[PDB]
């Protein structure tokens, strides 16, 4: 369902990593698969060539968290008015205190040693349930 | 403004706007003007005041977003807190 | 530009806002609507100095770059019982435990 159209007009853009993390661009090729491209680090711009109708989303480089294009999930190049490029402003979401909270614990403890802190089970399953691409196609689906 | 007391199990007593608190849907149950929490400690309930306000600051906001700081200290009491709050 | 605050004093710890132009003698205002208190029984402080009630925030060195949303500044608070001022006594939050093994 979510896949790139193919369209073949170009549309220049500037991937503007406006985080302070390492950010990794993530396109959706034809067949809905996400094919990954080179890293952002933080505060970095690109400009790159694109196409109308493509559809891309911005994660975490290391962790695979979730981030923000534009304010929103999913980015998708329009046209080109003027010659001009479009800005793609890839920011931090407010996360939910407890995402951050599992962000920060994830990032001290192994995932072999999930099991011996001393937490209630279902926040066991909730550290090892991390961040992933598929799972985010699948609800978006 | 109408504000809210949030005490701590040591005795801290926290006063903060009753809109930031409802943040919480815990917090809006167990009113519905003071509420004791037995388990958080106040290095935790003070953080947790803090995430309000940068909630209500930065939600829809263009202007870039900062980072919320954890101390890897106070990590996993913190995450029991937003867990047992839903925040 | 709003500045981000702890007014405290002994247990008791408020969260507010307030602008970089507005006065000490404002903050009081303010400290008086939630605990009842009037202006002339409160003492402001930064760290160890007693701040002036025409003075604004900003000049006291409360300024939106370092009074933040996430991490406020803190303002001490001491009350006057009968004749005299108390002295400024600010309670330490509790201590968090040693970093689990698996933490470190
Ligand atoms: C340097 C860089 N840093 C972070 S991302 C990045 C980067 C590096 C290289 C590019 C080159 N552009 C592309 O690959 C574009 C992006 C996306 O729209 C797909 N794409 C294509 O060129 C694709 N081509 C087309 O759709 C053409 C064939 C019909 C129009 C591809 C992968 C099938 C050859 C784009 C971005």
Redesign the interface.
Known sequence: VLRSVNSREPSQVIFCNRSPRVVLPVWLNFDGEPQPYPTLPPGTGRRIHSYRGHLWLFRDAGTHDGLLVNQTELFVPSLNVDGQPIFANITLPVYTLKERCLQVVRSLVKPENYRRLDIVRSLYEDLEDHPNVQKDLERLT | ?M?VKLI?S????????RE?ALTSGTIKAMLSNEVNFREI???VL?K????????????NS?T?????????????????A??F??? | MDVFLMIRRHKTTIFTDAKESSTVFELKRIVEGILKRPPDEQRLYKDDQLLDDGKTLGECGFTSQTARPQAPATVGLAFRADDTFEALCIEPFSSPPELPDVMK
């Open positions: 403004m504000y701590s040591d005795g801290h007593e926290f006063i903060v706007k930031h400690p106040s290095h003070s947790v005041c803090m995430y309000f306000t940068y909630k209500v600051r930065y939600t263009s870039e977003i900062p980072e919320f700081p954890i101390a890897p200290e106070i990590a996993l009491e913190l995450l029991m937003a867990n709050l839903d925040c």
